[PDB]
């Protein structure tokens, strides 16, 4: 419930069912669109008027190279909604902390910049506002904007919380993993410690590396692990 007011504009041109790798001759008004800036592309989603910029209209979307005017059509890979929804926008990427060469005096020793590879749009449950005391994120409906493919899809989310669709959303905990591809919902009481998450990934990597290093020994087949 809680459907947002389905208003209609005058510049609305629906891009659904269009070719992906083709440009549109006209130019859009950026004020009417959400501007999502990623590493390889800039993504535009229609922005219906709202007191807070949370309402998204996926009926018309455009993708352009970063800071460019030649709009295109994103490679839609999922049934995007036909109604206004409130999505929490959180980026997903890495920090490219680099040490640039120093030629001019007082040049920075380091250059820290954040590169965005994916952007997640998590729908608010029942389109409730952030200021609502009953606000909670509906992790079932998450949309991923990939910069590398310049495409937008829907997250394949596995729900492991007991309770089904009638569960209490306040105990949900979305666990994004595998380069923003595996989405899993778990109970908040089952949250892994950040130290455990790092050690678990390091243990798996080093174990495989150690085995490959020991594999070249000729008594490997008659040896145990410990």
């Amino acid at each position: 419930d809680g459907d947002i007011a389905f208003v209609q504009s005058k510049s609305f041109i629906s891009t659904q069912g269009w070719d992906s790798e083709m440009v549109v001759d006209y130019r859009i008004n950026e004020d009417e669109f959400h501007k999502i800036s990623l590493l390889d592309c800039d993504f535009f989603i229609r922005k219906p008027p709202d007191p807070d910029n949370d309402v998204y209209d996926f009926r018309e979307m455009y993708v352009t190279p970063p800071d460019t005017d030649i709009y295109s059509v994103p490679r839609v890979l999922a049934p995007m909604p036909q109604k206004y929804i409130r999505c929490a926008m959180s980026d997903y990427g890495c920090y490219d902390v680099t040490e640039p060469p120093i030629d001019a005096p007082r040049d920075p020793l380091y250059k820290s910049e954040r590169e965005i590879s994916k952007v997640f749009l998590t729908k608010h449950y029942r389109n409730r506002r952030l200021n609502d005391p009953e606000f909670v994120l509906d992790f079932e409906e998450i949309y991923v904007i990939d910069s590398k493919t310049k495409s937008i899809t829907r997250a394949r989310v596995l729900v492991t919380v007991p309770g089904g669709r009638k569960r209490d959303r306040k105990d949900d905990l979305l666990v994004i993993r595998d380069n923003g591809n595996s989405f899993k919902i778990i109970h908040v009481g089952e949250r892994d410690d950040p130290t455990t998450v790092i050690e678990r990934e390091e243990w798996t990597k080093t174990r495989e590396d150690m085995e490959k290093h020991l594999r070249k020994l000729r008594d490997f087949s008659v040896s145990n692990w410990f």
């Binding site: 590396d209 150690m210 290093h213 070249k216 020994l217 000729r218």
Partner: protein
Amino acid sequence: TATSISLGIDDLLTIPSKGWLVQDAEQQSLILEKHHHYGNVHAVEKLRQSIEIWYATSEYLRQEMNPNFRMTDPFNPVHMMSFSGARGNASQVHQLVG
């Protein structure tokens, strides 16, 4: 001073497979020498094999020295002295553990 890096007799870690490789090289050298006596190979062929089979073994031990130190004993005192570049190089360490 606080960490007090110090090398001992057993700190000079040798490649685990040195015994196998040296034993394999001896078997090839012994078999070839036996047939050189039989006359199936000539002196130059024996001379080349003796030099090359022991040089290839020595280079392989040097090649495998660092990955063995990294994968098994990263904080080996002899390894850290050369790997960090503080003192010595791989060739000098190879004279000690290879």
